[PDB]
Design a protein around this motif. Structure first.
Motif, PDB file in Angstrom:
ATOM      1  N   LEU A  45      -5.802  -5.793  -0.813  1.00  0.00           N
ATOM      2  CA  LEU A  45      -7.070  -5.673  -0.102  1.00  0.00           C
ATOM      3  C   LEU A  45      -8.165  -6.480  -0.787  1.00  0.00           C
ATOM      4  CD1 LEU A  45      -6.933  -1.859   0.690  1.00  0.00           C
ATOM      5  CD2 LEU A  45      -6.662  -3.703   2.337  1.00  0.00           C
ATOM      6  N   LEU A  46      -8.187  -6.473  -2.121  1.00  0.00           N
ATOM      7  CA  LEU A  46      -9.171  -7.269  -2.849  1.00  0.00           C
ATOM      8  C   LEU A  46      -8.950  -8.760  -2.626  1.00  0.00           C
ATOM      9  CD1 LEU A  46     -11.586  -6.999  -4.766  1.00  0.00           C
ATOM     10  CD2 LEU A  46      -9.981  -7.206  -6.666  1.00  0.00           C
ATOM     11  N   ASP A 105     -10.863  -3.693 -13.469  1.00  0.00           N
ATOM     12  CA  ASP A 105      -9.856  -2.641 -13.502  1.00  0.00           C
ATOM     13  C   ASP A 105      -8.640  -3.129 -12.729  1.00  0.00           C
ATOM     14  OD1 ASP A 105     -12.760  -1.500 -13.052  1.00  0.00           O
ATOM     15  OD2 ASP A 105     -11.765  -0.062 -14.383  1.00  0.00           O
ATOM     16  N   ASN A 158      -6.881   2.617  -2.596  1.00  0.00           N
ATOM     17  CA  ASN A 158      -6.956   1.816  -1.375  1.00  0.00           C
ATOM     18  C   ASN A 158      -7.896   2.408  -0.329  1.00  0.00           C
ATOM     19  OD1 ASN A 158      -4.856   0.256  -2.599  1.00  0.00           O
ATOM     20  ND2 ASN A 158      -3.334   1.621  -1.682  1.00  0.00           N
ATOM     21  N   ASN A 185      -4.944  -1.696  -5.176  1.00  0.00           N
ATOM     22  CA  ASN A 185      -6.211  -2.381  -4.919  1.00  0.00           C
ATOM     23  C   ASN A 185      -6.102  -3.899  -5.037  1.00  0.00           C
ATOM     24  OD1 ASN A 185      -7.333   0.279  -4.803  1.00  0.00           O
ATOM     25  ND2 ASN A 185      -7.656   0.215  -7.017  1.00  0.00           N
ATOM     26  N   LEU A 219       0.854  -1.184   0.000  1.00  0.00           N
ATOM     27  CA  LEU A 219       0.000   0.000   0.000  1.00  0.00           C
ATOM     28  C   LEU A 219       0.892   1.237   0.000  1.00  0.00           C
ATOM     29  CD1 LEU A 219      -2.986  -0.863   2.351  1.00  0.00           C
ATOM     30  CD2 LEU A 219      -2.384  -1.730   0.095  1.00  0.00           C
ATOM     31  N   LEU A 220       0.934   1.939  -1.130  1.00  0.00           N
ATOM     32  CA  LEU A 220       1.810   3.087  -1.292  1.00  0.00           C
ATOM     33  C   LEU A 220       1.005   4.380  -1.375  1.00  0.00           C
ATOM     34  CD1 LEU A 220       4.293   1.687  -3.975  1.00  0.00           C
ATOM     35  CD2 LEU A 220       4.695   1.914  -1.523  1.00  0.00           C
ATOM     36  N   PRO A 221       1.605   5.518  -1.015  1.00  0.00           N
ATOM     37  CA  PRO A 221       0.889   6.796  -1.178  1.00  0.00           C
ATOM     38  C   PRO A 221       0.632   7.151  -2.632  1.00  0.00           C
ATOM     39  CG  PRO A 221       2.675   6.982   0.417  1.00  0.00           C
ATOM     40  CD  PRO A 221       2.886   5.697  -0.311  1.00  0.00           C
ATOM     41  N   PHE A 222       1.654   7.065  -3.478  1.00  0.00           N
ATOM     42  CA  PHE A 222       1.546   7.384  -4.893  1.00  0.00           C
ATOM     43  C   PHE A 222       1.892   6.155  -5.720  1.00  0.00           C
ATOM     44  CE2 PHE A 222       1.873  11.954  -3.753  1.00  0.00           C
ATOM     45  CZ  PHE A 222       0.803  12.406  -4.498  1.00  0.00           C
ATOM     46  N   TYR A 223       1.188   5.985  -6.840  1.00  0.00           N
ATOM     47  CA  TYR A 223       1.387   4.856  -7.747  1.00  0.00           C
ATOM     48  C   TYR A 223       1.724   5.406  -9.127  1.00  0.00           C
ATOM     49  CZ  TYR A 223      -0.226   1.414  -4.366  1.00  0.00           C
ATOM     50  OH  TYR A 223      -0.346   0.595  -3.269  1.00  0.00           O
ATOM     51  N   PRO A 224       3.009   5.595  -9.437  1.00  0.00           N
ATOM     52  CA  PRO A 224       3.365   6.203 -10.716  1.00  0.00           C
ATOM     53  C   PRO A 224       3.128   5.236 -11.861  1.00  0.00           C
ATOM     54  CG  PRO A 224       5.319   5.834  -9.300  1.00  0.00           C
ATOM     55  CD  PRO A 224       4.179   5.068  -8.716  1.00  0.00           C
ATOM     56  N   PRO A 225       2.786   5.741 -13.043  1.00  0.00           N
ATOM     57  CA  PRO A 225       2.542   4.854 -14.185  1.00  0.00           C
ATOM     58  C   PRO A 225       3.816   4.158 -14.642  1.00  0.00           C
ATOM     59  CG  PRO A 225       2.580   7.134 -14.898  1.00  0.00           C
ATOM     60  CD  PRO A 225       2.615   7.160 -13.397  1.00  0.00           C
ATOM     61  N   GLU A 226       3.627   2.983 -15.235  1.00  0.00           N
ATOM     62  CA  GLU A 226       4.738   2.184 -15.738  1.00  0.00           C
ATOM     63  C   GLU A 226       5.449   2.889 -16.889  1.00  0.00           C
ATOM     64  OE1 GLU A 226       5.797  -0.739 -14.432  1.00  0.00           O
ATOM     65  OE2 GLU A 226       4.273  -0.572 -12.860  1.00  0.00           O
ATOM     66  N   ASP A 257      -0.437   5.100   5.374  1.00  0.00           N
ATOM     67  CA  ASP A 257      -0.169   5.391   3.968  1.00  0.00           C
ATOM     68  C   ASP A 257      -1.411   5.794   3.196  1.00  0.00           C
ATOM     69  OD1 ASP A 257       2.832   4.536   3.388  1.00  0.00           O
ATOM     70  OD2 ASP A 257       1.978   2.975   4.675  1.00  0.00           O
ATOM     71  N   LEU A 261      -7.599 -10.141   0.064  1.00  0.00           N
ATOM     72  CA  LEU A 261      -8.066 -10.409   1.421  1.00  0.00           C
ATOM     73  C   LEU A 261      -9.588 -10.495   1.472  1.00  0.00           C
ATOM     74  CD1 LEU A 261      -7.687 -10.502   4.569  1.00  0.00           C
ATOM     75  CD2 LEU A 261      -7.665  -8.010   4.488  1.00  0.00           C
ATOM     76  N   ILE A 262     -10.269  -9.582   0.775  1.00  0.00           N
ATOM     77  CA  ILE A 262     -11.729  -9.583   0.758  1.00  0.00           C
ATOM     78  C   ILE A 262     -12.257 -10.862   0.121  1.00  0.00           C
ATOM     79  CG2 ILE A 262     -13.686  -8.520  -0.420  1.00  0.00           C
ATOM     80  CD1 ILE A 262     -12.480  -5.813   0.274  1.00  0.00           C
ATOM     81  N   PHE A 286      -5.094   3.190 -13.508  1.00  0.00           N
ATOM     82  CA  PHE A 286      -3.936   4.032 -13.248  1.00  0.00           C
ATOM     83  C   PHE A 286      -4.336   5.189 -12.344  1.00  0.00           C
ATOM     84  CE2 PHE A 286      -1.886   2.142 -17.057  1.00  0.00           C
ATOM     85  CZ  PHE A 286      -0.667   1.847 -16.484  1.00  0.00           C
ATOM     86  N   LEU A 321     -11.898   0.115  -0.452  1.00  0.00           N
ATOM     87  CA  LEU A 321     -11.777  -1.238   0.078  1.00  0.00           C
ATOM     88  C   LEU A 321     -11.403  -1.218   1.554  1.00  0.00           C
ATOM     89  CD1 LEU A 321      -9.918  -2.847  -2.945  1.00  0.00           C
ATOM     90  CD2 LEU A 321     -12.287  -3.263  -2.302  1.00  0.00           C
TER      91      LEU A 321
END
Lengths: 514, 514
Positions: free
Chosen positions: A198-199, A252, B195, A195, A180-187, B252, A201-202, B183, B198
């Protein structure tokens, strides 16, 4: 009296054959029911995934000489043959942890001494066949008489607890793969995805809870009896289907799904072929290794004997309503001979699985519909048949061509199914009840024979000794001396027959250990 | 009985005072227990959040003339005064949906006719005070004898079902604010965060499940009796604390937390002050509006009377073991007079809350520790006292200076608490049991008087009529004719007394409806 010694060569095998084989048409006919389909659907998933996991691990350890296709082929062929010819067709064969440990140790030894791995396996298998034949011919399977419920309870509790621990560790690994990161930069498996953890685990928790609630719905009073039975039988397939459909709608998010090799081919076509020559392919095999391969064969024999016989003892308890009969000499011969002959084609050895067999037996148990108001139901019967095992083995073998269907199933649903299996496997052990009785006050204890005839503080000491043994065995397994685990467990048989009588009295031991 | 007519002015009020006031030292002394602290902790959270939500909605509707601080001040003052002087101090006062609907309708009417909103509210409150005084002076609260459990069950079921629906809709809105995207590019409340949805769902479900499991732990056999009682009493505070710590460990991810205005100030200091002149601030008030403000006063009177009296009827049922006494004339006078006097200072009117009062009563119920094995527990007593209500109102009023502590609590825990409250509020209604009896077969029904003396198909028609009434009321509430909802419910009293006897027989009606 299946464990009595007759005094004539191959006596136990003949007795087992004569006792079990006449029931063959009944074995074929008892499979015409709707519960068998649910059992097949449940156990197919319960058995396919460990093969993939252990195949990946085995390919990692042995530098790609043995992988997933070999394990799948071995599982399918051995399961089909055992279910067709075995005296107890309710056992499920497969791979396990100690077998992997032995394989990695033998690979390291062969690499150190500059020997070929597969030819050494061939000679080990031949020696194992010889040893198993000699053991069966002398009615050597009567020593199962000395395995008390002490050892059986220790073994079952340890195995189920380890099962649950590995399931939770597999869940934990996802949270480190996709944090779980604050920012998710694009590849090249995806990493650092949003997501996902957590998904997963759910999905796991939802599958487990739906299965548990549907199982509890069986003993309720809503709807008719037939509808209740039908819905309760198909609880786990319904859970799996519902959670798969829930995961399918959300497109997604990335989730990891089942992967299965396509086509019937060896893992490393360049290094080896399907048939392993016994005299060496690229180098001559030294005769001294041929002679000295007896010791690893002895270790394999001890491991297979302990696992298979303890599993067969647990499955065939008197409280589970087993009627048609049990085979302690035929099953051992079949497993040993098939494992030894598997060495020629470079396939891994297999043994009976405890949790899988217990789950297969539980799935076929029919309880009394006339449940006494406010009373725990009692087992009515168990459906004894050979069709379910053959079908499960055939499906496992045939899964190599059903990749399109299997690539739509995420792993979190299987995690929830494994959690349910491990939880329900621990409810059939007396150690669990005697461990729950520690928290309860001394005046609420039930009317069990180990409560009335034994003092309260002399019953907790027995549980303390059992827990100490379990902890010591787990610690030994975790360290680098795990190869001695099958021996140490075998050391709990003298302990009950030489030291426990020095502490406890006979009347206490007869009720505490029975 | 308190519902008989005496024939002298203010007779019911004098009787209620003489019946209840002598028990005052017992009311003060009954609050020295550990269960009262847990009740205070639970109901403080149960009551604070609806004030914030309705204050936000009210500020949106009325263009900032009334907001959150006004609602908090009104709740605190009215709760303290009612708990100090009321004849039934177990009622919890607050805002509700119909009050919001009336306020928005009156604001629209005042805007259309070019009139001042707050002065109109002042005159409406004065007329309401006059009407309530006239109604009480004539012993007009004896008509509560005609409110059969038919209407009470309909009202309670509808209210609880709507409660659950709004909780789930809030969760859905949380999902829509922060969708699951492929994204998440980096770039005024935050939006499009990863995040968040969820995690909120997980927190809600975890809080609800921990609370439910800890509630179920009360009737088990593990641990001692004192430990079981202590753990069961503090189940909801423990759930809240555990989930708050779990959310606090993860730093986070963004989650929405409680916000509370800081300082004691009016929402719009530029537009208005604390005191609203009755003769007009910027314009003279026309006398015709002063005379004609009686009709909205009549609507408010009908709403407050109906909802408060039905809540008092539900709370004071015979099965709940209420001993010290009930007041049907004093509570109405107190609520009406305080609401009417609230108009001068620009504060909203308040009424008793059904779910909140039922939850407050449930939190103080003491069950019999001698639970019969395999039997439903029996209520031993209910702790009657005034301290908890005063403490809750004081805490709600004081929360304006505890913002630092409150800004660390996410809203998903409160969502789970609301779900638990709404679920446990539906288990005390006979309609719920009679609705569950539809699914069960006709031979498993219990020995209730509406099963033995009534045919199976003649007790499902009663439930069908009740469900039709509930659905019609919900549909009316949803559309633009919601302002007529208090009237339509009042139309179910003739239906039971004029039309139901034409279908059902006296024997059937006497057992089906209490």
């Amino acid at each position: 009296d299946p464990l009595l010694r007759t005094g004539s060569v191959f006596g136990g095998l003949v007795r087992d054959v004569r006792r079990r084989y006449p029931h063959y048409p009944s074995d074929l006919r008892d499979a015409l029911h709707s519960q068998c389909v649910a059992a097949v659907l449940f156990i197919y998933f319960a058995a396919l995934s460990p093969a993939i996991t252990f195949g990946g691990l085995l390919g990692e350890k042995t530098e790609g000489l043995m992988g997933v296709s070999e394990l799948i082929v071995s599982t399918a062929v051995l399961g089909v043959l055992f279910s067709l010819l075995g005296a107890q067709p309710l056992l499920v064969v497969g791979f396990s942890g100690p077998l992997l440990v032995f394989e990695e140790a033998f690979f390291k030894f062969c690499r150190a001494q500059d020997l070929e791995y597969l030819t050494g396996r061939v000679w080990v298998g031949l020696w194992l066949v010889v040893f198993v034949l000699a053991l069966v011919a002398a009615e050597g399977s009567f020593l199962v008489r000395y395995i008390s419920p002490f050892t059986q309870e220790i073994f079952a509790f340890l195995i189920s607890l380890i099962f649950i621990y590995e399931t939770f560790y597999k869940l934990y690994k996802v949270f480190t793969e996709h944090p779980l990161l604050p920012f998710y930069p694009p590849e090249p498996s995806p990493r650092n995805q949003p997501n996902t953890a957590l998904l997963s685990l759910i999905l796991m928790l939802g599958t487990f809870f739906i299965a548990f609630f549907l199982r509890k719905f069986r003993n309720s009073r809503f709807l008719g009896g037939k509808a209740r039975r039908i819905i309760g039988d198909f609880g786990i397939p319904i859970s799996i289907l519902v959670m798969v459909l829930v995961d399918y709608s959300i497109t997604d998010t990335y989730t990891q799904k089942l992967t299965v090799p396509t086509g019937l081919s060896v893992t490393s076509p360049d290094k080896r072929s399907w048939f392993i020559p016994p005299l060496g392919s690229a180098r001559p095999f030294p005769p001294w290794m041929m002679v000295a391969a007896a010791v690893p064969a002895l270790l394999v024999l001890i491991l297979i004997f302990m696992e298979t016989q303890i599993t067969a003892l647990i499955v065939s308890q008197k409280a589970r309503r087993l009627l048609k009969g049990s085979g302690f000499h035929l099953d051992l011969l079949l497993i040993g001979s098939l494992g030894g002959l598997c060495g020629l084609f470079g396939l891994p050895w297999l043994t009976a699985a405890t949790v899988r067999s217990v789950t297969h037996v539980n799935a076929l148990t029919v309880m009394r519909t006339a449940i006494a108001p406010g009373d725990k139901p009692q087992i009515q019967e168990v459906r004894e048949q050979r069709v379910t095992g053959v079908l499960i083995a055939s499906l496992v073998g045939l899964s190599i061509v059903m990749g399109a269907v299997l690539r739509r199933i995420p792993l979190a649903v299987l995690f929830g199914i494994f959690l349910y299996m491990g939880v329900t496997s621990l409810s059939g052990i007396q150690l669990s009840q005697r461990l729950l009785l520690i928290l309860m006050p001394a005046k609420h204890h039930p009317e069990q024979p180990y409560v009335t005839k034994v003092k309260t503080w002399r019953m907790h000491l027995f549980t303390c000794i059992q827990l100490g043994c379990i902890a010591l065995l787990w610690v030994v397994k975790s360290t680098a001396a795990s190869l001695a685990f099958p021996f140490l467990l075998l050391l709990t048989v003298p302990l009950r027959h030489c030291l426990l009588p020095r502490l406890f009295q006979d009347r206490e031991l007869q009720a505490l250990d029975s």
